[PDB]
Amino acid sequence: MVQAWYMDESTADPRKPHRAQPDRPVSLEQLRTLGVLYWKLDADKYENDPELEKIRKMRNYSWMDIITICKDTLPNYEEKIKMFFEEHLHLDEEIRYILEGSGYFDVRDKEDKWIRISMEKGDMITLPAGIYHRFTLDEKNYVKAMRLFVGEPVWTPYNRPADHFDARVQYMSFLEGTA
Ligand SMILES: CSCCC(=O)C(=O)O
Ligand code: NI
């Protein structure tokens, strides 16, 4: 099952697991209280998968593309990787479905503590508009992912602080309503 955990207090080597000690695992149920949703799929079938279609139709994910994060392949790699890992929010959902490889999505919990979510092949996640988050490769230094979007995409990150946005205000309001 998909693994997530509270992080330790080391700021070094962000691609390491950084598991809090003792272990403080985080469940999919706790992630849902943050508005973070998850589906498990057969990533070998991504070109033609009725199960992915069920999710895309339910959620109105009408747009997709594929991105490959690789030190050799990706244009403007070093700058893009830095922008992924700066703590930021978006005014839309961030939806990613991992097709190959792996990485970490970090999200803030209700007390603004970091939770690290380990995403591997077959894992699909949506991070709600307004949530503070970041992404890093793990020590294997490779991921291929499908990006999805509700309509034509706008990718703009707003690096924290970004508290004035309506999307952030509405998200804070959502958090009051969950466990
Ligand atoms: C696993 S997708 C690569 C990360 C990314 O697209 C993002 O942070 O927006
Ligand atoms: Ni983002």
Q: Enumerate the domain spans of the chain.
A: 1-179
What method was applied to determine this entry?
X-ray
CB 150 within 8 A of CB 62: yes
Determine the number of helices (DSSP H) and then strands (DSSP E) in the chain: 4, 10
Ligand 1 neighbourhood includes 103 CB (under 6 angstroms)? yes
User: For the purposes of burial, counting CB atoms within 10 Å of the CB of 147, is it exposed (0-12), middle (13-18) or buried (19 or more)?
Assistant: middle
Ligand 1 neighbourhood includes 84 CB (under 6 angstroms)? yes
Binding annotation for Fe(2+): 88, 90, 94, 133
Fill in the amino acid letter for 100. E
CA 102 remoteness from chain centre: 11
Distance 104 CA to ligand 2 centre (A): 12
Length of the chain counted residue by residue: 179
Q: Hey, what are 69's tokens?
A: 């994060």
- Torsion from C-alpha of 173, 174, 175, 179, nearest 10 degrees: 130
Q: Which of 97, 104, 135 to mutate to test the pocket of ligand 1 (most atoms within 8 A of CB)?
A: 135
Q: What is the resolution of this structure in A?
A: 1.8
The ligand with the least distance to the CA atom of 81 is 1
Ramachandran angles phi, psi of 42, nearest 5°: -85, 95
User: For the purposes of burial, counting CB atoms within 10 Å of the CB of 104, is it exposed (0-12), middle (13-18) or buried (19 or more)?
Assistant: buried
Please tell us whether the domain made up of 1-179 is placed in CATH 2.60.120.10: yes
- Torsion from C-alpha of 127, 1, 66, 126, nearest 10 degrees: -10
User: For the purposes of burial, counting CB atoms within 10 Å of the CB of 179, is it exposed (0-12), middle (13-18) or buried (19 or more)?
Assistant: exposed
Ligand 1 neighbourhood includes 69 CB (under 6 angstroms)? yes
Write down the H helix ranges in the chain: 28-33, 50-59, 77-85, 166-176
How many whole angstroms separate alpha carbon 104 and alpha carbon 116?
6
Write down the H helix ranges in 3-155: 28-33, 50-59, 77-85
